[PDB]
Amino acid sequence: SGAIYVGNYRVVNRHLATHNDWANLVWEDSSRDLLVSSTTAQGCDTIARCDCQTGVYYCSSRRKHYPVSFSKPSLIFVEASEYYPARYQSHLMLAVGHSEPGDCGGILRCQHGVVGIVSTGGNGLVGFADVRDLLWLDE
Ligand SMILES: Cc1cc(C)c(CC(=O)N2CCC[C@H](C(N)=O)C2)c(=O)[nH]1
Numbered sequence: 147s148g149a150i151y152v153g154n155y156r157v158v159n160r161h162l163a164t165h166n167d168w169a170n171l172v173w174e175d176s177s178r179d180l181l182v183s184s185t186t187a188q189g190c191d192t193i194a195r196c197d198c199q200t201g202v203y204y205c206s207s208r209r210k211h212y213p214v215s216f217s218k219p220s221l222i223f224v225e226a227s228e229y230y231p232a233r234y235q236s237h238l239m240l241a242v243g244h245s246e247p248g249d250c251g252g253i254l255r256c257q258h259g260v261v262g263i264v265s266t267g268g269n270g271l272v273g274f275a276d277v278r279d280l281l282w283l284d285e
């Protein structure tokens with residue numbers, strides 16, 4: 147689990163959105179596994195606006211932050227799960243790192259701010275849904 151809190155927005159994995167998120171919906175995109183809802187309180191996270199390919203992510207299954215190198219946002223095939231059929235997920239970045247089901251929502255960050263959130267995983271792989279192109283999160 148986990149979210150980005152920037153301005154009056156809450157960014158979560160679409161597959162983990164709650165009823166309150168859907169009832170306060172700003173934007174959602176199943177192809178990216180992202181959903182943004184509105185908040186009453188202002189958040190403290192800032193979004194990175196860069197082309198970094200190195201950063202650090204939070205892994206809840208190890209209670210640890212790990213440095214990673216990650217690929218550029220791309221269209222990647224993701225296997226069928228209990229949340230989506232087998233499909234191509236867009237704006238996804240892959241890295242070598244530990245992940246398990248339940249780690250979705252952990253933040254990936256660089257020196258410029260938040261880059262994205264954990265959205266997929268494999269044997270020694272972790273995938274992140276990029277948010278750097280969502281300029282509207284800044285206003
Ligand atoms: C090792 C490991 C295995 C699995 C299965 C996962 C979870 C996962 O990738 N998905 C399930 C939740 C919807 C995700 C999506 N964006 O389509 C796809 C994980 O994080 N780590």
Ligand SMILES: [Zn+2]
Nearest residue numbers: 196198256258
């Ligand atoms: Zn950066």
